[PDB]
Amino acid sequence: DRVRSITLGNSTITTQESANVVVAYGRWPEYLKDNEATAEDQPTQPDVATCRFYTLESVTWERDSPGWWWKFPDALKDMGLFGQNMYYHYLGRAGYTIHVQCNASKFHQGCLMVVCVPEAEMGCSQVDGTVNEHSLSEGETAKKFASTSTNGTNTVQSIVTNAGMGVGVGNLTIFPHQWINLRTNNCATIVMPYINNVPMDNMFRHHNFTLMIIPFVPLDYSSDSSTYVPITVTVAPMCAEYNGLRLATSL
Amino acid sequence: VVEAVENAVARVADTISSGPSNSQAVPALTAVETGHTSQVTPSDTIQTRHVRNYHSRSESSIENFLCRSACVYMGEYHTTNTDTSKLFASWTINARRMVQMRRKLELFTYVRFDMEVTFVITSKQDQGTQLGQDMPPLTHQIMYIPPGGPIPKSVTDYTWQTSTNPSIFWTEGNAPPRMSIPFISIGNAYSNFYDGWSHFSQNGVYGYNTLNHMGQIYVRHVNGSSPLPMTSTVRMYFKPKHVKVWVPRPPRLCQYKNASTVNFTPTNITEKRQSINYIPETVKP
Amino acid sequence: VVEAVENAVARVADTISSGPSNSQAVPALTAVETGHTSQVTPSDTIQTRHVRNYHSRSESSIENFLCRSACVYMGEYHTTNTDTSKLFASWTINARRMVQMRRKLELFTYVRFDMEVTFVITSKQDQGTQLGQDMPPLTHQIMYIPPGGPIPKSVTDYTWQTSTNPSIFWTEGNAPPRMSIPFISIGNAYSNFYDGWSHFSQNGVYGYNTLNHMGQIYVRHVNGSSPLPMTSTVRMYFKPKHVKVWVPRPPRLCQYKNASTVNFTPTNITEKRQSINYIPETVKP
Amino acid sequence: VVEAVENAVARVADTISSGPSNSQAVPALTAVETGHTSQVTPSDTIQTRHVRNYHSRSESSIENFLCRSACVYMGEYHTTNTDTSKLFASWTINARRMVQMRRKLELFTYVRFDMEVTFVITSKQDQGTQLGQDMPPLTHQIMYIPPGGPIPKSVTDYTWQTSTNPSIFWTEGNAPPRMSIPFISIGNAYSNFYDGWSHFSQNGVYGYNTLNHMGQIYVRHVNGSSPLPMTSTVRMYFKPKHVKVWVPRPPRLCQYKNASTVNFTPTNITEKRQSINYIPETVKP
Amino acid sequence: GLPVMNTPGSNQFLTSDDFQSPSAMPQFDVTPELNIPGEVQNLMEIAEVDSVVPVNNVEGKLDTMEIYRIPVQSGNHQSSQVFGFQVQPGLDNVFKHTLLGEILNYYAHWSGSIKLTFVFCGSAMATGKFLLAYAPPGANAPKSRKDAMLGTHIIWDVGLQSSCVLCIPWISQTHYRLVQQDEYTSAGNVTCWYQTGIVVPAGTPTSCSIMCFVSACNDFSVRLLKDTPFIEQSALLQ
Amino acid sequence: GLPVMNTPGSNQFLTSDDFQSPSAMPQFDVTPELNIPGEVQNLMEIAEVDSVVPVNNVEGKLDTMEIYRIPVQSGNHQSSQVFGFQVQPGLDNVFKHTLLGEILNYYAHWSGSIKLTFVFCGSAMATGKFLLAYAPPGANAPKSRKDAMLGTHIIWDVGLQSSCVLCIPWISQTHYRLVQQDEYTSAGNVTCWYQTGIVVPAGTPTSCSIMCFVSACNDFSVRLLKDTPFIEQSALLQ
Amino acid sequence: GLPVMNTPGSNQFLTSDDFQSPSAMPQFDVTPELNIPGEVQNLMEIAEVDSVVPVNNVEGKLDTMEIYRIPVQSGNHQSSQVFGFQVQPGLDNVFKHTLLGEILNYYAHWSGSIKLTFVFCGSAMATGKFLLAYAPPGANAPKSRKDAMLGTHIIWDVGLQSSCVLCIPWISQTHYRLVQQDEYTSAGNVTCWYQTGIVVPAGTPTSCSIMCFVSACNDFSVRLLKDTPFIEQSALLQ
Amino acid sequence: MGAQVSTQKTGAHIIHYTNINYYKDAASNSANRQDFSQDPGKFTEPVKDIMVKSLPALN
Amino acid sequence: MGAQVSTQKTGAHIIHYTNINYYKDAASNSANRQDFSQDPGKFTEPVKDIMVKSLPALN
Amino acid sequence: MGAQVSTQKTGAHIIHYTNINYYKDAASNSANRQDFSQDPGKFTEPVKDIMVKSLPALN
């Protein structure tokens, strides 16, 4: 009951200590139907060159770590043919499978929350100011939450308790989420469908959802146990569609 | 007796599942020269999953779009003055002086509906050096005069007998007055635009004022009192219902100039940006 | 003809009777790591009697929760001044300036509905040394201008012709004006949060102001009068109906700062107490 | 489609005809010690005629008893001052400050319903030596803030963006604003009385304020104007609907003291008369 | 025309009325409805979702994650109480800003059962058992495990399953309680004690923490809508 | 008479109410209905009609027809990008004054798919192929054809049929987006590149232009009515 | 659009109207309904419950329990009247603060029969018989037992059953009487007299007391809602 | 079209009306003024053993 | 008594209401908010010969 | 005449009303206050494999 296998394209993930799988709102990803479309040209569907697991770079979970976030898309814009299909079209559409891995021994302890937040609009550390995109995202590198109130210009207000959105961090369980409790499991898996108020959208302009990893119980260990404990993310697009082919944009 | 009436809910189309293709069907190739708009959906150009869509187009129907109250006129009148024409308010009926409702109505060429009319009346004291008096509640009269009826000359004119004209009497501190009006036009539908003249020699009056002719409104104080002067303001609100509209038009781009014409000052198509390729970067550390 | 429409009442679940147990079923042992919330009732952990529950969840449905009127804007305008821009009021339409309705709406990501709009207008006299005059009833005009229409420059501008814009005319002392608006958005549902930009280079304008674009409101006095100056205040009230909402969110904890952004000052999670065991004693002689 | 809905009329009982009697049945002898109230009618003690009674208990049902609007709050706010906290009004939501509605609600222990909310806003001129100016219509904003949201500090604070809070915008001279609210409580029914504490050590806060926690209301002028100062007053009206109540209580005898407690001053049971036999004589020539 | 007579209530603006009104945009054609995931039909669906409770709300910790952790450790600490609080889901500082609390503060009356889930976040080699107890109103809060064992309680054994649920059942003399709870509608208290203690082998951290989640059962309901006291402004444009 | 009790909301004026009211003209006989062509029943019928997009909105061209033309030419220009813009159908200057944009600015929420049609208006002897690409939010906009080819795209071949449709499908985490789009509800970008280049014979003009039309699909819808910010006045009689 | 005409009553706020209004919280999910004991559906259910009448409301006793007791004793006291009062269930000081009186003061019109129950609270060895009489309006109140015996009366014998019911039947020329009763809608009077006297053995207290309860029958009803004159304030926050 | 037709409140010794619901939430509907049920025995006769009213209460 | 009963606007994933008409003129009735028809082909496809959408537009 | 008759909100332990629509647009109708559906499993049980609640969650 704890072993699982997931195959997509030419990639496969195995796990021996999984809890279950979260399907965001009971809805699996699927293609756009004819009585819900507005764009008229025939779309392209690569179907194995884009729908496969891509791995980002890892972060180091330390004893005093506030947490991390990524923005999707724009974290996969340099990933193979998914990124190339993003650069040549005006409209795109895709669901995702997210898989977070972190293993440790039976003498370690700690607890992480893994949550996906749709339309996570963030605020600036200067209240009479506006944010820029570098402070929101660094591609495949993670942004870091902070330990206290932040200051200075152009940075995002990132104290963990408010999640940078002006809410209580303990209520983020309203979104699709799982937990990694080091004594129970070593991986989390979330299946996210396409969620928007329009049927397709431009993938450079709009961040569809933010992935947050926040430790509630810090990492602890004793005399000569291993000190280096990394966390790794792996994401696979599903039912990917593109419309509006023209010359390649340049950021 | 009870009668059950059924209401059909209307939702948008579902998207169907679609797979790879290699054939001679070219749904994405068209020709706009025909005047035809392409009926292509995402499932004709990409691979899609099946989605059951439950969204409804209920708030974009014409009735829900137009059935709200909007201000169309505001006016002032006194209880005591030295002009005797500022003791009552009067105006000709139309919907062309407040730009919001009138731009909303001008999305169509012809319209037909009944109306619900509401009035909001407020009073205030005129700035004098000596204040202090108790005044009884004020009463106001509103009279509608269809074209051809006699016109009041003062606040004591015999014409406020209102024997056949419909009037409203109201006193302050109560709910706002309200009444409904049917579709009153000598034509089969109202006309928002008229590209014609009034005289057969192709001159005279041009445009909208040729066709409306729907009477006037007069408002006065009933007390005839107040050694210390007061001032009232009346506001009128329209709300159309049981609507039908024909022949849609492009929305007004330029700002309005007056209530009679469609006159305008040339305006741009939009505001500028840096270059035809400019992109704002928002993913930065 | 009469049509009978049936209404299904929806009550909460009854609790069933339960007795002692000694087995391998462990309803109280779970694992929150899965993202699943336990569906256990009191009858799984203690001995219970049978109760027939008649309570209904009728006042917590979305429609009954959101279908009330709330103030969204207040503004002032004069009959006489030396500025000519203070003779009329104007503003851009949204629901972000009054914190109660806007916090209530932001419990969800997307919303779709029709609207009922009401206006409450009041007038008053400006403080002058010499008072005393009788003023006739005041009339007010409200005009809605959709994006692209011409903008008034004064209170005598031609644009108050309101040929195609919808307007309301109203006079003080009547019921407040009211009208209904359908669901007007170029998207399939309204958006309360937008984590994106306006320019394809990921810069420009961030967040909510990119997507709303729903026009403006202009309000004036119609009388054009009053040697002694007066001042009016207008208040606008929204009421949504025929509602649908998607993707719930955690409620706003920090206080709002401005109408454009989600900017905030860091706030605590709650207030303190003495210690993790502190109990207030209330049974004392 | 039409659906016929049937309404059962409910009238009081008829009195039946009765004649002389001499038996062992003793309907008039009872015992109140049991806690039981006697179900005897006139036909059990005297001789009666047959009467067909058509009276109905329709106006004493709970819904018709409670479904009327009552004032629950009134407050003031200025357009210009030297305090910057008197430029807007704010208060915590409850129904405990006006004694009529609150005594009516306290006939029961628990209540559950939806609400209809109405606002009545009026303005006036502040007493100055020099009067005379024309002011444009005033606009007002009402914002509801659920617990945890950011709090405005001034009338120009960013928090009036009202991105997620619901707000109402209104202008004077229109109908009063109105909206409906569903049953919003973390419990299964509202609680009018709470004989308990907030801390587990039986101390802290006692009584009603432990359980309500339903947010705040903020109101401001939108114009940001008026070199001559004005003053507005806002009044709020509640109307419950779709009601259910439980556990009736004896009506309040003593006068209320404050909005937090049930504190009282000892009062008499009634007023006096001359003696236990006193009769007023009314048949005199 | 037809003779009529106006009744009281004419020309008033009641903010919770339900009437018809004319449309300002006749025959407007709305955008078709799309089937977006995650549609909400009742506010009680949100209150049935677990959210984390800030049990450790003492001075110096109101803005750190330490506000969410309950501390436990190994050794002889049986005489020490683990935690305790009142049952006031919309009034107490412990419950007022959670999902359930935030929903209740829009209402005046509530009723139903309440679920508390506890999760142990120690090492895989630590063992222990705890006693979770709920006492009804009428007495002071218990001062020892012997007193607390007399009310409604459960004994939690830590093992491969990490979570244990304490269900607080609706025991009240009235059908509804006030969200603004007073002494008349009090609901009781909850306390935790060591049933045996925590035992660990060598090479493991001694201290551990527990977390607590709150949610509502399927017999829960609220009524009497009102405004919330958590949001406020001092002027427009906020 | 019958006993009654007044509730809150009495004697208020709500501008979106729906009640009955007495007629000021009893038994008035209206003009019969005529069957005029072109009746509209929903505002979404207007938004499904193509309208021309002003893609070239740069300084000096805001009041000329040049604002509608996209320039292309022959020769080696593969490294140059043709055009690019954000997907903000009611916010961006590129889309806000079109039919679809004008309808959306009366509403707060939108949802559905969007159609862009491109027409080549060169000579009958010119040949070429283009790549039209849409990228989802999450990254910066592509800077080369290799990056753009990784998103949703189509390759347009110019021939006897003059028009090609790029359909932008609804890919979003929420059911609706805001008309006043922020960073949370962003939707992505669109870009165009030379797939091969333009080839012409002698005797033909070298430069050509492309035009772009926008419209809505059959799964599109809007909600939450509001006033538009495009029309305004400073006094009555305007 | 559709032609319409506004009638009188437009834009008014009537505090007893019944209209529809838009929701400020679309699709809010309410807490489920719980089955709490003691649900009330009509105010007449409360008025059918007995409550104690303060018959002895004379000077010096308005704040003691002595206000509820009617005194009786042994010996020759036949010429003395026991008690008497008018039938004004919402007006007389004797009835106005009871349950029935408190409900009636919210209304203007009432109709129906009224039950008075009398309970003897002496020793088990005391015996006696009383005459309870109701006289209709039209004459002055009786001054002796011989006059009182001519109206509607009952003879109560004290024994193992402690309680006797005098039912006042609805005898009126109009269908309804005013709650604020005047001379036109008067209803009569009630009086009590010794039929034989009280007899006790040695070793028993001589004085005893009687108590009286009032309630409404199953043909009772009220109409014309109004505000009550028993509650008042001089400023807000009360 | 989802219309409800029901009887009006009249006297004793043409009479029906029509309603349409306009909004998506049931909290927007008008009040339920025409439901008249009663159950007084809950408060006036809350005893375990039944009392006949022609029989003595005790013995 | 001439009552109409029809369904209310709800969501998806007791619900009907009653109406009576009080006045003699139909211009006094409330708005018709529950009629949702469409005919877009009048504006988007106004051509004499039918176009299949999988076939070329010309030739 | 297109009248809808539906039941009123009452208590538990003559009751219907009539509605007529007066306007041509459905956005003019009154709110839908009498629709009470629920689907909580969308937020509380969003898992791929079903969990029985009497069985262990793991193993």
CSV table of N, CA and C in Angstrom, one decimal, chain D residues 203-259:
chain,number,residue,atom,x,y,z
D,203,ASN,N,-11.8,31.9,34.1
D,203,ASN,CA,-11.6,33.3,34.3
D,203,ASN,C,-11.4,33.9,32.9
D,204,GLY,N,-11.1,35.2,32.9
D,204,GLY,CA,-11.0,35.9,31.6
D,204,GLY,C,-12.2,36.7,31.3
D,205,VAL,N,-12.8,36.5,30.2
D,205,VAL,CA,-14.0,37.2,29.8
D,205,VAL,C,-15.2,36.3,30.0
D,206,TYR,N,-16.3,36.9,30.6
D,206,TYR,CA,-17.5,36.2,30.9
D,206,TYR,C,-18.6,36.6,30.0
D,207,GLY,N,-19.4,35.7,29.5
D,207,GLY,CA,-20.7,35.9,29.0
D,207,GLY,C,-20.7,36.0,27.4
D,208,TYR,N,-21.3,37.0,26.9
D,208,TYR,CA,-21.7,37.1,25.5
D,208,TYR,C,-20.5,37.4,24.6
D,209,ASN,N,-19.6,38.3,25.0
D,209,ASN,CA,-18.5,38.7,24.1
D,209,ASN,C,-17.6,37.6,23.7
D,210,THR,N,-17.6,36.4,24.4
D,210,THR,CA,-16.8,35.3,24.1
D,210,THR,C,-17.0,34.7,22.7
D,211,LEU,N,-18.3,34.8,22.2
D,211,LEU,CA,-18.7,33.9,21.2
D,211,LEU,C,-19.1,34.6,19.9
D,212,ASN,N,-19.2,36.0,19.8
D,212,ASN,CA,-19.8,36.6,18.7
D,212,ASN,C,-18.8,36.7,17.5
D,213,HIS,N,-17.7,37.6,17.7
D,213,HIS,CA,-16.6,37.8,16.8
D,213,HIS,C,-17.1,37.8,15.3
D,214,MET,N,-17.8,38.8,14.9
D,214,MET,CA,-18.3,38.8,13.5
D,214,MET,C,-17.8,40.0,12.7
D,215,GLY,N,-16.7,40.7,13.0
D,215,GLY,CA,-16.1,41.7,12.2
D,215,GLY,C,-16.5,43.1,12.5
D,216,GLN,N,-16.1,44.0,11.6
D,216,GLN,CA,-16.4,45.4,11.8
D,216,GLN,C,-16.9,46.1,10.6
D,217,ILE,N,-17.4,47.3,10.7
D,217,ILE,CA,-17.9,48.1,9.6
D,217,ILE,C,-17.1,49.5,9.7
D,218,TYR,N,-16.7,49.9,8.5
D,218,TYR,CA,-16.0,51.2,8.3
D,218,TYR,C,-16.7,52.0,7.2
D,219,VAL,N,-16.9,53.3,7.4
D,219,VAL,CA,-17.6,54.2,6.5
D,219,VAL,C,-16.9,55.5,6.4
D,220,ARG,N,-16.8,56.0,5.1
D,220,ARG,CA,-16.1,57.3,4.9
D,220,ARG,C,-16.8,58.0,3.7
D,221,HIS,N,-16.4,59.3,3.6
D,221,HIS,CA,-16.7,60.1,2.4
D,221,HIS,C,-15.7,59.8,1.3
D,222,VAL,N,-16.1,59.7,0.1
D,222,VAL,CA,-15.2,59.4,-1.0
D,222,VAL,C,-14.6,60.7,-1.7
D,223,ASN,N,-15.3,61.8,-1.6
D,223,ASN,CA,-15.0,63.0,-2.3
D,223,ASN,C,-13.6,63.6,-1.9
D,224,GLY,N,-13.4,63.6,-0.6
D,224,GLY,CA,-12.2,64.2,-0.1
D,224,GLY,C,-12.1,65.7,-0.4
D,225,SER,N,-12.9,66.5,0.2
D,225,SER,CA,-13.3,67.8,-0.4
D,225,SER,C,-13.8,68.8,0.6
D,226,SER,N,-14.6,69.8,0.2
D,226,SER,CA,-15.4,70.6,1.1
D,226,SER,C,-14.6,71.5,2.0
D,227,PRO,N,-14.0,72.6,1.4
D,227,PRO,CA,-13.4,73.6,2.3
D,227,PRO,C,-14.3,74.1,3.4
D,228,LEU,N,-15.6,74.1,3.2
D,228,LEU,CA,-16.5,74.3,4.3
D,228,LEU,C,-16.9,72.9,4.8
D,229,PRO,N,-16.8,72.6,6.1
D,229,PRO,CA,-17.0,71.3,6.6
D,229,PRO,C,-18.4,70.9,6.6
D,230,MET,N,-18.7,69.6,6.5
D,230,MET,CA,-20.0,68.9,6.5
D,230,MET,C,-19.9,67.8,7.5
D,231,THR,N,-21.1,67.3,7.9
D,231,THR,CA,-21.2,66.2,8.8
D,231,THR,C,-22.2,65.2,8.4
D,232,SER,N,-21.9,63.9,8.4
D,232,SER,CA,-22.8,62.9,8.0
D,232,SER,C,-23.1,61.9,9.1
D,233,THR,N,-24.3,61.4,9.1
D,233,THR,CA,-24.8,60.4,10.1
D,233,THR,C,-25.3,59.2,9.3
D,234,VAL,N,-24.9,58.0,9.7
D,234,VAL,CA,-25.3,56.7,9.1
D,234,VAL,C,-26.1,55.9,10.1
D,235,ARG,N,-27.1,55.3,9.7
D,235,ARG,CA,-28.0,54.4,10.5
D,235,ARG,C,-28.1,53.1,9.8
D,236,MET,N,-28.1,52.0,10.6
D,236,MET,CA,-28.1,50.6,10.1
D,236,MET,C,-29.3,49.9,10.6
D,237,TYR,N,-30.0,49.1,9.7
D,237,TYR,CA,-31.2,48.4,10.0
D,237,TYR,C,-31.1,47.0,9.6
D,238,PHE,N,-31.5,46.1,10.6
D,238,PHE,CA,-31.4,44.7,10.4
D,238,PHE,C,-32.8,44.1,10.2
D,239,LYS,N,-32.9,43.0,9.4
D,239,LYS,CA,-34.2,42.4,9.3
D,239,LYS,C,-34.0,40.9,9.1
D,240,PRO,N,-34.3,40.0,10.1
D,240,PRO,CA,-34.1,38.6,9.9
D,240,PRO,C,-35.1,37.9,9.1
D,241,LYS,N,-34.7,36.9,8.4
D,241,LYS,CA,-35.6,36.1,7.6
D,241,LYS,C,-35.1,34.6,7.6
D,242,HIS,N,-36.0,33.7,7.3
D,242,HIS,CA,-35.8,32.3,7.3
D,242,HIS,C,-35.3,31.8,8.7
D,243,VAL,N,-36.2,32.0,9.7
D,243,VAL,CA,-35.8,32.0,11.1
D,243,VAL,C,-36.1,30.7,11.7
D,244,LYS,N,-35.3,30.4,12.7
D,244,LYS,CA,-35.6,29.3,13.7
D,244,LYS,C,-35.1,29.6,15.0
D,245,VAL,N,-35.9,29.4,16.1
D,245,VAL,CA,-35.5,29.7,17.5
D,245,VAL,C,-35.8,28.6,18.4
D,246,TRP,N,-35.0,28.5,19.5
D,246,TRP,CA,-35.2,27.4,20.5
D,246,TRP,C,-35.1,28.0,21.9
D,247,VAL,N,-35.8,27.2,22.8
D,247,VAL,CA,-35.7,27.4,24.2
D,247,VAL,C,-36.2,28.7,24.7
D,248,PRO,N,-37.5,29.0,24.8
D,248,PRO,CA,-38.0,30.3,25.2
D,248,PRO,C,-37.7,30.6,26.6
D,249,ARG,N,-37.6,31.9,26.9
D,249,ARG,CA,-37.2,32.5,28.2
D,249,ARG,C,-38.2,33.5,28.7
D,250,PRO,N,-38.2,33.9,29.9
D,250,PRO,CA,-39.0,35.0,30.4
D,250,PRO,C,-38.5,36.3,29.9
D,251,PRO,N,-39.4,37.3,29.6
D,251,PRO,CA,-39.0,38.6,29.1
D,251,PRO,C,-38.3,39.4,30.1
D,252,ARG,N,-37.4,40.3,29.6
D,252,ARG,CA,-36.6,41.1,30.5
D,252,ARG,C,-37.4,42.1,31.2
D,253,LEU,N,-37.3,42.1,32.5
D,253,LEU,CA,-38.1,43.0,33.4
D,253,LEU,C,-37.3,44.3,33.7
D,254,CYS,N,-36.0,44.2,34.1
D,254,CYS,CA,-35.2,45.3,34.5
D,254,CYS,C,-34.7,46.0,33.2
D,255,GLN,N,-34.3,47.3,33.4
D,255,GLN,CA,-33.7,48.0,32.3
D,255,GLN,C,-32.3,47.6,32.0
D,256,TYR,N,-31.9,47.8,30.8
D,256,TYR,CA,-30.5,47.4,30.4
D,256,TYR,C,-29.5,48.5,30.9
D,257,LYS,N,-28.3,48.1,31.1
D,257,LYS,CA,-27.2,49.0,31.6
D,257,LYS,C,-26.1,49.2,30.6
D,258,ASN,N,-25.6,48.1,30.0
D,258,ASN,CA,-24.6,48.3,29.0
D,258,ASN,C,-24.7,47.2,28.0
D,259,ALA,N,-23.9,47.2,27.0
D,259,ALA,CA,-24.0,46.3,25.8
D,259,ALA,C,-23.3,45.0,26.1
